[model samples]
Target: SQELTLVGKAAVPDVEVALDGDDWRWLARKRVLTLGVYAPDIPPFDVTYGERYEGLTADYMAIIAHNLGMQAKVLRYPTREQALSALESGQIDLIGTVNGTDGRQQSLRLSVPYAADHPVIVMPIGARHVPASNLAGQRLAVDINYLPKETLARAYPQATLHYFPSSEQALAAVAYGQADVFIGDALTTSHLVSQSYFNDVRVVAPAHIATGGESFGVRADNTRLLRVVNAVLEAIPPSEHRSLIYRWGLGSSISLDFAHPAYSAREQQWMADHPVVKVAVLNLFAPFTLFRTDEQFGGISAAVLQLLQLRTGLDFEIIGVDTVEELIAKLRSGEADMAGALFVNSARESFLSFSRPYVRNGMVIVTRQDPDAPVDADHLDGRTVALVRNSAAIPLLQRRYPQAKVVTADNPSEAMLMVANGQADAVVQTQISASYYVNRYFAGKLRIASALDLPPAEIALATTRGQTELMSILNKALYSISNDELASIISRWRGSDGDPRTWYAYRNEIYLE
Candidate 1:
C-alpha cells in the first residue's frame, strides 16, 4: 500500500513501494538511517555539535526520511577523513552532506544535488578590493586539503597559497595581515564573517572555482536508498530552497552598503545649474589629499570626493595648491567652489561656509625619545618648539606658552625633522599631519611628547560664503556616510592599526609623502 502525507504545506512522496519489496522491507525493519557528518561547519547547510544535528541539511534530511517513512540518526565525526572511513565500514548509511567530487564518485553513490555554493575572496576590512584575475604576487590562505593544489596553482599562477587546518585560522590570517586574502565557499565564509572572531574581515570578491552541486554521499552498493533520497529531493519546492538560503544569510557575497543618498529637489537643481565643482586641495597633506607623481590628485579626500560624485552625479575637478593657506585663498577668492580639508575656525567662518566635520584632530607635541624630554607646556618654559609657518598652531602655541621659544618651519615633515635632528627641543603641529610624518619618515627617531590640552580641531570641507545650497548638499552626503565606511577609508590611508594617534608611528617609510 502507498500513502502520501503533507509536511509543512508540501506533499511528501511515497517511496515505500518505489523500490523492490525486499529493499523496502529491509529499510522498514532497520527503522533508522545513519548519517555521517564532517566539518567546514557552514550554517544552514552543515553544522554539528556533539551527537546533535541542525541546519538546512538536517531539515532536508528529516523531510526526505519522513517521506520515506523512517527516522534519521546523525553520527558526528571530527574530520572528513574519519567520516569517510566510517561510511566505508558501514558504520553510517550515508555522508550527511558533501560536494560532488570525482574521487568520491568512484567509491560512493551520491544523491541528486540539493544545493550549490560558489567561492569568494575574503580580506581584511580595509584592504583594497582585488579581482580574481589580478591576484598575482599576493598571499592567499585556504583550508588544508579542501582546494586541490594543482587547480589553485593553475587558477592563480603567481599567487602563494598557504593552507591551514581550519577555515577560522585561514580567515584569521587575512584579518591579522598574515595573508592578503582568503579563498573559501561563499556560505561558509559569510557564516564565519558573521561571527565575532572574524568580524574585522570581509568578503571583497568572488572566486570562480566550484562547478558541481552539494549532495549526500552513500556507499557504492546502496543504489536503492540513493534513488529514494533523490526522488524526495526532487519533490521539494524551489521556494523552500530559497527560504532556507535567506533564513541563514547564505548568499554570493556580503553587502558593504555604507552610504545612503537623500537629496532635496533644490539641491538637485543647484547641481544641474553648476555641473562642475572645482576643489582646491593642499598638495602636501599626505593621507588626506595630495598631488601624485602622475599629476593627479590622490588620498582620503580624493576617495571621499569620488564617492560624493558617484552619489550626486556631479563632476568634480581637483585643483592642487602648495599649502593650506593657498587652499583657503582659492576658496575665498571664488577660484574654487570647495577646499578639500580645512579646520573650522571663527576667522575662516567669516569667508567660508563649512561642511559637517568629517574627522576630529588636534595639535600635539613631537619630541625625540628622551626620558627627560618636556611633555607638558610648563616643561617647555625655555625650550625651542618648531611650528609650521602661516598655520593655526603657531599663534596657539605663542599665546598659551609665552616663555617657550617658538620657531617656524615650512611643514609637518620639516618640524618633525627639526626635533629628530636636535635642532628644536620639540615640535607643535596638528596631530593628523605630524603623525603621518613621524611614522612614515622618523621611524625610531621621534615620539609624540604630550597632549596640548586644547579642543580637538574639526576637519571639514570649506566653501565660499553664500553657497548655502552647496554646503547643504555636502552635509547630506557627509552625514549619509556610515561609520564603517569612514573607518575603512581612514584605515586604508593610515595603515592597519587604524588609530589616528598612532597612524604614523608604525609604517617604515612613506612613498606618498
Candidate 2:
C-alpha cells in the first residue's frame, strides 16, 4: 500500500519497475545504492555535513532508495567531475541530482527529469538588462563545466567568456567587477543574493536559457537501476517535489504569514473596539497609493493596508483623495483615522503620530539627457525647474535654489513631460514617481540628473496625535512584516512585469543625495 500525501492531497504511488525476478534478486542482493554527491554545501539541493546527508536531492534519493527496498549510501566528492568519474569506475551506483547534458549523457544513463534549472543574468544594483544583441565585447563569467560550452558560445558569441570552477567564484567575479555579468542558475543565484555576501549583486533578469531537468545519473550499463529510479521519480506526486522545493527555500512561491503581533492587551482591546479603520489614501500617487479605475484603492501603501487588515481582522474603509495634501488634511480634520502613506516631517509631526516607517522617499532631478547637464541643485540657479503641484519637493527646491525659476505641474508625469518638451530645464520630484514617468512615458528621452541634497524622508502611516493606542497596534502589525515578505512585495511591484507607473518601480534605484 505505497502511497503519498502532499499539502493535504492524497496521491497514489505509480511505480512500475520493468524487471524480472532475476533482476530483482540482483538489486536485493546488492542491498544498497551508493550515491556520489558533489557541491555538498550547496543549499536547497545536495548538502553533506560529516557523515549525514541532507538537502532536497538527498531527501529525494533517500525516499527513492527506500521505495526500491535498498539503502542509500551517500558519498561526497571534491567535484562533480570526480563524482562522475567514480560513477564511470563503478565505485558508485549513481550520482544524485545532475543536470542532463549531452556530454554527461554520452557516459551515463539519466533518469526522467524531476526538476529544472533556469539560467539568469546576475549583475550589480542599478544595472539595466543586458540584451542578447548588446552583449558583444562584454565580460561574461560562467561555470563552463555546469553550463554547456556550445550553448554559451552560441548565446554570447562576441563576448569574452571567463570560466570559473564554481558558481560562487563566478558570482564573486561579477561582484568584484572582474566580469561584467555572471550567468548562473536562477535558484543558485537567488539563494546567493539572499545571502549577506552577495548583497551587492542581484538576479535582474532571466537569461531565458533553461537546462534540461535535473536527473539522477547512473552508469551507462545500469539500465535496470535507471528504470527503477525513473519509476520512483514518476511515482512521487509533483506537489511533493514542490513541497521539498519550498521547504528547502529553493522556490520563490512560498507565502509567509505575518508573525505574531507585538500588541499589548490594551492595544488589542482598542483595535477590537474600533473594528473599522478609516484610511485616507492619495489617489494620484501611482504604485504607492492610488485609486484604480474601479474606484478601489490599490498601490504599495494600499496593499500594505490590506496586509494590516488581514493581520488585525479589521475592516479598512479606504477614502481616496486627489492629492497627498488632501489626505493629510483629512487626517488633521478627524475625517479619517489615518493617512495610508505619509512622509514624516517636522511640519506634519505637529498633528500626526507616525507609525514605524516601512519605506523611504527621496527626490531626484529629472532632465533631458544632455552631456553638459547639471548634476546638482546649485547648477539650476538660473534655470526653469518643474515640480509637482503641492509636492514636498517644491519647498525644498525653493529653499535651496532661490534664484531658480520654479513652475508647478499637476503631477510627476506632467512635470517630466514639461522637461521633455523644454518647458523646464529639469523636474525635481520624488524618485519613485520620476522613475515611473521616465520609464513609462519618457524612456530614452529623460534621465535622472542627480538625487536632491536633502534628508531621506521616511514613509509611514500617520494618525492624529491622540490615537496612541491605534498607533501602537499599527506599529506592531507593521513590524510583524518579515524581511522576506517585504522583499517579495517590493519585487512583485518592481519586476519587469510590474506596472512601470508605480512608485515602487524605482524604490531600489533611488539613493540619498
Candidate 3:
C-alpha cells in the first residue's frame, strides 16, 4: 500500500495519498493544480460561455478545487474534438466528466470512479406493458458520439439504430415519427423527460446496459496528481456520493408540476380517472422517440409521458412499435390507448382524436437561389422534382403543378441529395428537414427557394377516436405550457427559428438578419 500523508491542511481538512501505480512521487513539489473538462454538447458540465455555466460536474469540481486549495479555471469547448485538441496542445491540465478507456488511459492517467450509472430504455406508454422483445424489429434512437450507443450497433446487429448528434435532436427524431426507441444514460434520459421536452416518450423498462460513472483524468505524465486525486475521492463517504447527482437534475424523477400551471387542474382529474396511461410509439426516430444507444427508451414521447405522469400521479408504460404505421394500426385496433409521433394530418382525424397542436411546421422547395431565376412553370416542366414517395407533398404538388416531373426517393435525405447532385432540379420538403439537409449535408451547395409556397402544418398528439376524455386531459397539459417553455423545447430539438410556423418562430423572426 503506497499510502502517503500530508503534514498540513492545504484546502481540505486532511490530505492522504494512495497510489495505484508507482508514479505518485511528484505531488509534494506542486501546490497549484488546474483542471479541464469535456462534456460534448451537454451543458453545465462543460458548456460554452454563451450558455449557462453551472452543472453537476462543474459543482463537484468546484468542491474538489476548494478542498485542494488550487485555482481552477474552466474552459468550455463545444465538442469533444476541441477538448481533446486542447488537451493534446497542453492548453488544459486535465479533463473531467470523461470515462477511462484503454485507448484514453494510454494517453491520460485515470482517477477512481466518481459516479455509477446505467443506460435506460425509453419507449412509448401503451395499454399492455411492453417487453424487450418488442424492440427487436423497431429502430432504436442513439447518439453515435457516445460509446454505449456505438456499442449497441456493433453488438446488436439485428436491431436498427438511428443516430443523432444530441439527445434533444434524438428526441425530435422520435417526435416526428422517425424512430421508435431511444437508449441512453438513466440520468440523461430521465432529466430530459422530466423537463417536459420529451413529453410523449417514457422509460419502458429497467436499464440493463451500463457504462462507468463520471471520472477525472490527466495526462499520463501526471502520475503523482492522479494518485492524489484518487485518494481524495476514496475518502468521500459513499452514502453522500449522491449529492453530486441531485444537484444536477439527475438521481430524481422529473416533475410535471413545474411543467405548466394548466396541468394542475387536469392532473388531478387524470389521476382520478386513470391510474396509468399507456402510450404506443414507433422506435426509429432519434431524440423525439427511439431506443437510445444506452439501451434505454426516450425522446419527445418519453418527456411528455414523464410530465403527464408527474401531473396525473399515474404511471406510464412505454410500448415499442416497429413503425408509425404499426402504431397507428395499434391505436385503431384498440390495442393501444394512445400513439405518439403521429404528425397531425387532416387524414388522421377520420380515425383518431388529436391533442391541441404542440409543434407547428411546414415545407420548403429547395433550389439554387439564383436572383434571375425563371418564373414560368415551363422552366421546371422538363426538370425533375425530387419527391418522397407517399409524402403529403406528392399529391399536393401533383394537384398544383400537374406538368412538373416528379422523381421518387426513399427518404428526405435521398430526395435532397437528388437536387443537390443536380439529378433533380428541386426538392419540396419540410422546412426542418430541408434546413437539416442544407445546413448539415449540402451547406452552400444548395439554396432554399423563397417563392415556392406550401401551407404550414401543425403537429399534435394523436389518440384513439372517441377518446374525448383523454383528449381533454392532454389539452389541459398543452394549454399550461408557457411560451418560454415552448421556446426552450423547440430550441433544444430544432434550434431557434427551425420550426418557422410555431409561435416561437414569430418571436424569433427578427433574428433572421
Candidate 4:
C-alpha cells in the first residue's frame, strides 16, 4: 500500500477554522503529525489503495491537518495493535480510526465519534443466514486485528476461530467453504461486498453488539491534539456532515444525526403493538431491490427498510421472492404486510395504499437513434413501442398514444433489448432503467432519444388499503426523512452483473470513498 502526506494539500480552501493561541503554539513546534493507517484497510474509513490512503478517516485527517495549517505524515502499519502501540509510544501522533472500548480508553484519548459502528454478520451467498448470537459450532473467520482473541473466544466459546491477516483473506475463507461466517462493522463489510472481486458472500444480519460509534484515537499524553480535533468536529455544521455522509454513501452505514423526527403516539403504539412487520421484496429488481427470499435482501429498498426500522422501532421481516408477480401475490394474500417496491396505479388502488413516493425518475424514450425533439404521445404515433408487462404506464400509453402499436415485454431489460434488436421502434422506461440497460448491455446499440412529457415514475412502499393505521405509520416515517437523505441514500442501489464471479457496483455511489 502507498502512503502520501497531506499537510496543506487536502485542506478546505475557503472555510475558516478557529484555533486558540495555545493550539497554534503547540502546532508550531509540531508542524507535522503522523496519522497511522492500520493495515488490511478497514474500508470507508482507512482504506489502503495501491499508492495512498483514501477513506473516511483519511478525509477527516486531511481536513484536520489543513485547518491547523500543519502537515499530516501518514504511515501504514501491518496490524491495528502495532498502530496502537506506536501511538502510545509517541512514534505516531494519532490513529485514524478506532471503536474505543473501556479497556482501551485507559491508554488512549478518543475524539467524539463521527460515525456509527454497527457490526454485521456475513456468510457465503449460498449459505443459510444464522444470527450472530452464537456460533453453534460453525467455523468463524476473523482477522487478528479486527477483534481480540479473547473477545471472540469469550463470545463464541464453542466455535473455532480461523484468523487471517486481512479481511479480504478472511472473507475469501468464507467464500471457499473453509468457514461458515464472518462478523465485521457494517460499513467496512458492505464496502468490501461492493468492491471486492470475491463476491460469493454478503452481509445477512445486523449484529446488535458493538453499538458504539467510531472516532479518532489519539495518544494518551497528547491532550491538546484531542481538544483541537473535538473542537473541529463540534464546529462542523450539519450540512458538511451530511455531505460526508453522501460522499461516502454512508447512508444506513453511519449514524444519522440529521434524521430525528419524533413519531406520534399512534405510530408509537402501532409499532409497540406490532414489533415484526412483514415486508416482501421483489428479486431481480436491480437499482431498486435485490432479493434473497426470507432473509438477505439488499439494495436501495434495503437501505430504506433498514432506516425505517431504525426510526420507527419496527422490526421489518424481509420476505424475498424471485419475481414481481409473486411479490405482489404475497402482499395480496396477507403473507406479507406490505410490498417493498410498488407503483401506485388504478388496478392496485382497490387493495393497496402506497406511501408518498420515495423515489422518482422521469420517463424517457430509448431508441436506436438520437432525436432532435422531445418524445411526446405524438412522437410514437404509428410506431411499435415496448414496455414492461403490467407496467403502470401501459393504460396511460393506450390513452395518449392511440395510434401507436403497443407490445408488452417481461422486464425493462427485455423491453430495451427488443428496441436494440430492431423488434421495436422505441422503448419507454424510467430514465434510470434506460441508463442501466444502456450501460449493462446495449451500449451503442441503444440511445436515449428523448425525454417524455409524462409524469415521472414514482416508487413507494405499499400496504393494503384497509390497513390505514399502518399506512399512516409508514407515511410519517417517510416524511421524516430529509429530502437530501432520501435522494442520496434511499435511491442509491448496488448493482451486480450476471457473471460467475458475481461482481457488484453502485449505480449511484460507493460507500467507501
- Candidate 1 lDDT score at position 203: 68
lDDT of 1 by residue, 1-513 (tens): 111121232343343335565767877897988777776566657665554567767767777777777876777677877888888898888786677454345778777777666677787754444745667888989988457787788788899899998888998898887999899876677667754533366665567575356788888887877877887788777766655655665532223222367788998899999999999887777778876665666777876775576456677888888766667778878889998887777666777788887777776888887876787666898999987676665666778887889887765556667888788989886676667766766666677777786677677888988888888888888876655456656655665323444665345345455
Off by over 4 Å in 4: 1-4, 7-23, 26-55, 69-118, 123-133, 174-178, 196-229, 237-252, 255-336, 346-351, 364-379, 384-395, 398-402, 405-428, 431-451, 476-513
Q: Write the per-residue lDDT of candidate 3 for residues 134-154, one digit (tens) a residue.
A: 467777787665555456865
Model 1 vs. true fold: TM = 0.52
Query: lDDT (0-100) at residue 427 of candidate 1?
Result: 86
Q: Residue 263 in candidate 3 has what lDDT?
A: 41
For residues 416-491, could you state the per-residue lDDT of candidate 2 as single tens digits? 6788888988887667666665666565678888888876756789899998888878887887775555655554
Candidate with top TM-score is: 4
Clashing pairs in 1: 439-504
lDDT of each: 0.71, 0.70, 0.60, 0.71
Descending-TM-score candidate ranking = 4, 1, 2, 3
Clashing pairs in 2: none
Per-candidate RMSD vs. true structure? 12.2, 17.9, 16.4, 7.7
The 10 consecutive residues of candidate 2 with the worst lDDT sum are 1-10
Between candidates 1 and 3, the lDDT winner: 1
Ranking by lDDT: 1, 4, 2, 3
If both were scored by lDDT, which would come out higher, candidate 1 or candidate 2? 1
